[PDB]
Amino acid sequence: AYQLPTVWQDEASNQGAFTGLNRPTAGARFEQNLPKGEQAFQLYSLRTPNGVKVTILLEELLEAGFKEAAYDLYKIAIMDGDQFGSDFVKLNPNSKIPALLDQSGTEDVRVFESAHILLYLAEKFGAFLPSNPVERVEVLNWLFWQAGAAPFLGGGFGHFFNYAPEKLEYPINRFTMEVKRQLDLLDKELAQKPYIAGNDYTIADIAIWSWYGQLVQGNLYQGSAKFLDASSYQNLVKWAEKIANRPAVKRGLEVTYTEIK
Amino acid sequence: AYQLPTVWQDEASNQGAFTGLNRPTAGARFEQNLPKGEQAFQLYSLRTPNGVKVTILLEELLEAGFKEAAYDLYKIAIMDGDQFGSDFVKLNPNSKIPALLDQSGTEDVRVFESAHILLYLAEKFGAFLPSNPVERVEVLNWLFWQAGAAPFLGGGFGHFFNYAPEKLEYPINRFTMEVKRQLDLLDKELAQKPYIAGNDYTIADIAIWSWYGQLVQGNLYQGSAKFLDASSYQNLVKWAEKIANRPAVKRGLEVTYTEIK
Ligand SMILES: N[C@@H](CCC(=O)N[C@@H](CS)C(=O)NCC(=O)O)C(=O)O
Numbered sequence: 316a317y318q319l320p321t322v323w324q325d326e327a328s329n330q331g332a333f334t335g336l337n338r339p340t341a342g343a344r345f346e347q348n349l350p351k352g353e354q355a356f357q358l359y360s361l362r363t364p365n366g367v368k369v370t371i372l373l374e375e376l377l378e379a380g381f382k383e384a385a386y387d388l389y390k391i392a393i394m395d396g397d398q399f400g401s402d403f404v405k406l407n408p409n410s411k412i413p414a415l416l417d418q419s420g421t422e423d424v425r426v427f428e429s430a431h432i433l434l435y436l437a438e439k440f441g442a443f444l445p446s447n448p449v450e451r452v453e454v455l456n457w458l459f460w461q462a463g464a465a466p467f468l469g470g471g472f473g474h475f476f477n478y479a480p481e482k483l484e485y486p487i488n489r490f491t492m493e494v495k496r497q498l499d500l501l502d503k504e505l506a507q508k509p510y511i512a513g514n515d516y517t518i519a520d521i522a523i524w525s526w527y528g529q530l531v532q533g534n535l536y537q538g539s540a541k542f543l544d545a546s547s548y549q550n551l552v553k554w555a556e557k558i559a560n561r562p563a564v565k566r567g568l569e570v571t572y573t574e575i576k
Numbered sequence: 577a578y579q580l581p582t583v584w585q586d587e588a589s590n591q592g593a594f595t596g597l598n599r600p601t602a603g604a605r606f607e608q609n610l611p612k613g614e615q616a617f618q619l620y621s622l623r624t625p626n627g628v629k630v631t632i633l634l635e636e637l638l639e640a641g642f643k644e645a646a647y648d649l650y651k652i653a654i655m656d657g658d659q660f661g662s663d664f665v666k667l668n669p670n671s672k673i674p675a676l677l678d679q680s681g682t683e684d685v686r687v688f689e690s691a692h693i694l695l696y697l698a699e700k701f702g703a704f705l706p707s708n709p710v711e712r713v714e715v716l717n718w719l720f721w722q723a724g725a726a727p728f729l730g731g732g733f734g735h736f737f738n739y740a741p742e743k744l745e746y747p748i749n750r751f752t753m754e755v756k757r758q759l760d761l762l763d764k765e766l767a768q769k770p771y772i773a774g775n776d777y778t779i780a781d782i783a784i785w786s787w788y789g790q791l792v793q794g795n796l797y798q799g800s801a802k803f804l805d806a807s808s809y810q811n812l813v814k815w816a817e818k819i820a821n822r823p824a825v826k827r828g829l830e831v832t833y834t835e836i837k
Pocket residue numbers: 336337363364365366393398410411412413427428429430724725
């Protein structure tokens with residue numbers, strides 16, 4: 316058995332692919348000058364569940380006729396430490412993608428947290444978020460929900476199922492049970508409504524689809540759809556298939572990134 | 577070693593105090609009629625890090641002279657299964673506290689996710705959230721941040737350090753490292769600014785203080801301040817002491833709850 320220390324020390328445990336990148340301290344580790352284009356929106360991201368949220372919304376907005384949603388899109392390679400460069404830390408001191416710079420105003424505005432970026436864009440354009448104050452509250456409920464729930468899917472289930480050097484029974488059981496409760500929840504809501512927060516497709520759908528929709532379609536962690544009995548959540552599956560077939564979702568998944576070095 | 581199943585089954589693992597309450601399915605488990613008062617705001621909550629966020633904001637608003645922020649406050653005992661009663665599930669299908677009913681309008685509006693409740697109240701009253709659109713974005717950055725980061729503190733560190741039947745080396749190391757990175761981040765921001773998002777106390781402070789401020793003050797998990805070397809984050813400590821001394825924070829921690837049965 317393990318003797319729990321009275322004060323924790325970093326004794327470099329092997330945490331899988333992110334060992335060396337994961338640290339108990341925050342901050343920039345090297346000077347980095349990021350490229351910047353001419354469009355209003357400079358998006359510093361990666362094709363991941365969080366990153367596709369934002370490229371899906373931007374493509375949906377473009378598709379809806381909002382041509383002022385044109386963006387430049389740069390690859391921050393988080394397996395390479397790019398998120399620790401000084402210019403990226405200026406955009407998001409948390410060193411995570413996505414981070415958005417909006418240089419459209421008179422002052423540059425940094426926007427981070429994927430769910431926040433969804434909100435910020437939706438409010439800016441008045442689209443994919445209902446104007447009706449009551450419908451709006453219910454959309455935000457699910458948006459914030461996603462923000463609070465995804466860590467258990469990504470940081471818990473994902474990490475212990477896919478990344479950790481050893482399969483560990485008790486944490487796998489704990490996060491698997493939780494992810495299944497989240498999938499049952501979503502499935503039971505989608506049994507009653509065409510979209511997560513009602514009758515229309517919104518930023519809540521985008522936020523949740525990028526994680527849970529891709530998960531049930533078998534496009535997240537290898538072997539996870541089987542493991543989680545994904546095809547059992549048939550309301551969620553059907554909603555995810557519908558979304559996957561939207562032309563802007565396809566584009567928001569296929570858009571290509573500009574390198575930073 | 578453990579043989580990872582190809583399809584996961586619930587083989588009732590002992591998860592600590594929340595075994596039986598934690599399930600791989602969502603939904604109401606019994607018919608429940610919750611009490612309701614006359615005030616605009618009916619808050620169904622518990623004195624926890626999430627619950628104190630909302631009672632702190634309501635008390636701050638009352639203290640600022642907003643008397644329309646009067647609320648009724650009911651105890652949902654999550655160690656008792658209260659969060660699975662049919663009326664609570666109607667307020668929050670995720671079966672978590674806090675959940676707010678605003679019955680002030682012409683239509684009842686359910687608001688869940690603690691961070692969302694903070695936003696909803698702040699916007700409703702125009703207080704503890706800056707009006708200036710640029711300052712506002714930066715406040716929301718930290719608000720959403722808190723929403724995304726707390727699961728690692730609560731659902732990861734908290735659970736493996738405090739609740740799990742056995743102390744497990746690898747998950748403790750993983751979530752301890754993460755919680756320490758979050759504390760270093762906050763500490764490095766508070767080195768530069770009096771409050772988390774700038775010069776004024778906002779809902780971002782409230783949201784983050786209720787977790788990280790109480791943690792460094794030694795008011796979260798027994799033995800965690802020592803374990804995490806809390807007194808090393810002296811910017812965070814000092815900010816947390818300042819907040820703790822606000823008269824409405826005291827009230828928002830001391831407010832008493834009305835039972836539901
Ligand atoms: N709550 C954040 C989480 C974002 C996040 O986890 N980003 C990952 C990629 S999907 C990342 O940048 N990881 C870098 C690292 O942890 O070093 C959000 O929704 O934006």
